[PDB]
């Protein structure tokens, strides 16, 4: 087969060719080799699966929007329903692959607290995606696991990272989104976003050369979500 360096280069080609399923397959192999990922590799894996799952989430939203309209012929409404179920199946397979990686290889072996937080946030994200399409009893499971991952990441990050750290900020972003869209708690969502942005503003001196751009960007996303939500 191929070695780690070869797999990573293949992943970069795939990314440029916009072949994200290929990319995810390569980064999956690398991860399964069992060794801790460099920042580069870690980012490659994240991007790959974000795009793979992203395509399916987008398709699911389109089909659902369409599913909202009276359709006398039961075979059209029903047709679209079965198609939606297909998409949900693909989606669950992807998310379950990611969560498998996170539990077998990535989180347990994470040395730096930054890496730990990154992987736990990833786990929260993918359980959240499952939640977006999950059903009755399964939905409870999915939502709980999401919140647990987000909560652990959040505590670790408040203890170990600076409020301007992009990983910490993005964690806050996604977690607030979780409260708003998943737990339907607009109040707590806004509270979390506002607190995060405010703490980041208080300590602008903690910014550094390597990530000040990503920091300010995410702060912007936080404030944007805030405005969109408060109404």
């Amino acid at each position: 087969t191929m070695d780690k360096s070869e797999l990573v280069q293949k992943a970069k080609l795939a990314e440029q060719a916009e072949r994200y399923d290929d990319m995810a397959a390569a980064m999956k192999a690398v991860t399964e080799q069992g060794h801790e990922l460099s920042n580069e590799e870690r980012n490659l894996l994240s991007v790959a699966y974000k795009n793979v799952v992203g395509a399916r989430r987008s398709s699911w939203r389109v089909i659902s929007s369409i599913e909202q309209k009276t359709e006398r012929n039961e075979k059209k409404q029903q047709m679209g329903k079965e198609y939606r179920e297909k998409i949900e199946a693909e989606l669950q397979d992807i998310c379950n692959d990611v969560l498998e990686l996170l539990d077998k290889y990535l989180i347990l072996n994470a040395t730096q607290a930054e890496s730990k937080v990154f992987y736990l946030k990833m786990k929260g994200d993918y359980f959240r995606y499952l939640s977006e399409v999950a059903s009755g009893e399964n939905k409870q499971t999915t939502v709980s696991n999401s919140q647990q991952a987000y909560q652990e990441a959040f505590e670790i990050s408040k203890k170990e990272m600076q409020p301007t750290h992009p990983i910490r900020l993005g964690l806050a972003l996604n977690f607030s989104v979780f409260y708003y869209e998943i737990l339907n708690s607009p109040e707590k969502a806004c509270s979390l976003a506002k607190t995060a942005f405010d703490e980041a503003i208080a300590e602008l001196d903690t910014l550094n050369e390597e990530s000040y751009k990503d920091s300010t960007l995410i702060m912007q996303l936080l404030r944007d979500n805030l405005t969109l939500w408060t109404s």
């Binding site: 909202q68 996303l221 979500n225």
Partner: peptide, 21 residues
């Protein structure tokens, strides 16, 4: 950078329109 912001905006707005209504 503003494209990231626009994508984000659209993705949140979608939930606001289709899941809240």
């Amino acid at each position: 950078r503003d494209k990231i912001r626009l994508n984000n905006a659209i993705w949140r707005a979608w939930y606001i329109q289709y899941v809240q209504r």
